[PDB]
Amino acid sequence: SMRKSREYEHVRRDLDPNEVWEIVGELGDGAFGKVYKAKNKETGALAAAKVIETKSEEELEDYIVEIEILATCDHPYIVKLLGAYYHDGKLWIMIEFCPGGAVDAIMLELDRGLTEPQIQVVCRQMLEALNFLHSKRIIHRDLKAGNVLMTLEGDIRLADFGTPYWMAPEVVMCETDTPYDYKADIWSLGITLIEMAQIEPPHHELNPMRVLLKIAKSDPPTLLTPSKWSVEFRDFLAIALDKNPETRPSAAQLLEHPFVSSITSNKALRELVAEAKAEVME
Ligand SMILES: Cc1ccc(-n2nc(C(C)(C)C)cc2NC(=O)Nc2ccc(OCCN3CCOCC3)c3ccccc23)cc1
């Protein structure tokens, strides 16, 4: 047999998105692609929409993988799928708009890194989400501050905009599957905490040519000024930034670590997003 133009479970090809969704503007960009802000026709709910110019039905089948993953990952600390449409020769993906901004953009505008209680909340929530991702046998593979988006309410939304300062050593060294692929996120998480503490990641100052080398041959990175930080934090990094994927701890194991195991309030991150919000206009 052979199938032509299959009907995908979370996609509607029988309806224009412009019936439901009003294009309000361009949400900036990098080298990611073409993303747009949009308003709901019935409710006025804000959302972000990306559009891809798919030539063939073989291409379309590739790009919908992102939709299948987004749909199956319904969790309080992960971007949330609202819908997908395939109209004309354009695939539309939409998720709930995030008005806090990426954690790195927050750091840029304040010209300062996060405080420790700020880092603790991000860490605990990132951990809750990774534990869920690994629950579904899904690996992120590109964790960094730029993929941590913020709401005004105080909670993160984990994203992925699909140079390698956050790459795990076993992945740097690889020349070719393995039972400890999920662990690579845990290295990247650790590098993300240092990025959040010091604005930039380790080895930021080097020729990018040298970065894979440096990561392969160096001892795990540590905080530039340990005295400024808690013992719980330094210890957390030490066991998270383990070069052996086999002895590196799971997301679940770290949740029990005293650096995050008593964090219940999201307050410090509510307070953070507000400062950033207040300095947008002045
Ligand atoms: C191949 C592939 C497969 C899966 C993914 N993938 N995996 C995840 C998990 C792991 C977190 C569940 C998430 C994603 N994808 C994303 O999070 N992708 C996106 C990033 C940034 C965006 O917009 C910019 C930000 N914008 C403005 C602020 O408010 C939020 C929206 C997006 C706008 C609309 C639709 C998707 C967007 C990625 C790639």
The β-bridge relationship of strands 35-40 and 21-26 is antiparallel
Helix (H) / strand (E) containing 226: none
Whole-number Å distance between alpha carbons of 112 and 218: 27
| Residue 142 designated active-site | yes
Contact present, 189 and 130 (Cβ < 8 Å): yes
In terms of residues, how long is the chain? 282
Q: How many angstroms separate the first and last alpha carbons of the chain?
A: 63
Helices marked H in 84-227:
103-110, 116-135, 169-173, 184-198, 211-217
- How far is 151 from 101, CA to CA, in rounded Å? 7
DSSP state, 78? B
Alpha carbons 256 and 135: distance in angstroms, whole number: 17
Closest atom of ligand 1 relative to the 129 alpha carbon: 11
Find all residues with CB under 8 Å of 13, minimum gap 6, and list them.
5, 7, 85, 86, 87
Asked if 82 and 127 touch (Cβ cutoff 8 Å), the reply is no
Query: Do strands 11-12 and 21-26 pair parallel, antiparallel, or not at all (unpaired)?
Result: unpaired
Residue of the CA atom closest to atom 26 of ligand 1:
48
- Looking at residue 195, its amino acid is E
**Contact (CB, 8 A) for 172 and 187:** no
Do the Cβ atoms of 169 and 202 come closer than 8 Å?
A: no
Are 203 and 211 in contact, with CB atoms under 8 Å apart?
Answer: yes
Q: Which amino acid is at 141?
A: R
Ligand 1 binding pocket includes 162 (Cβ within 6 Å): yes
Class of domain 98-282: mainly alpha
CB of 66 closer than 6 A to ligand 1? yes
Residue of 39, 69, 137, 148 to mutate, ligand 1, most atoms within 8 A of C-beta: 69
Burial of 162 (0-12, 13-18, 19+ CB in 10 A): exposed
Specify the ligand 1 atom closest to the Cα of 159.
17
Within this chain, domains 1-97 and 98-282 share the same CATH topology: no
CB 142 within 8 A of CB 166: yes
State the distance from the centre of ligand 1 to the C-alpha of 99, rounded, in angstroms. Answer: 15
Domain 1-97 bears CATH identifier 3.30.200.20: yes
229 CA to middle of ligand 1, Å?
Answer: 32
Residue with tokens 């690996």: 139
Give yes or no for a contact between 127 and 158, defined as CB atoms under 8 angstroms apart.
no
Q: Which residues pair with 49 in a beta bridge?
A: 36, 94
Give the resolution to one decimal, in Å. 2.2
Taking a C-beta distance cutoff of 8 angstroms, is the pair 71, 65 a contact?
Answer: no
* Interval between CA 242 and ligand 1 midpoint (Å): 28
Residues 6+ away with beta carbon under 8 Å from 280:
109
Residue of minimum CA distance from atom 15 in ligand 1: 160
Residue spans per domain, the chain? 1-97, 98-282
Residue 197 in contact with ligand 1 by CB distance below 6 A = no
Q: Which two three-digit tokens encode residue 60?
A: 């379309």
Solved how?
X-ray
Q: How far apart are CA 237 and CA 234, in angstroms?
A: 5
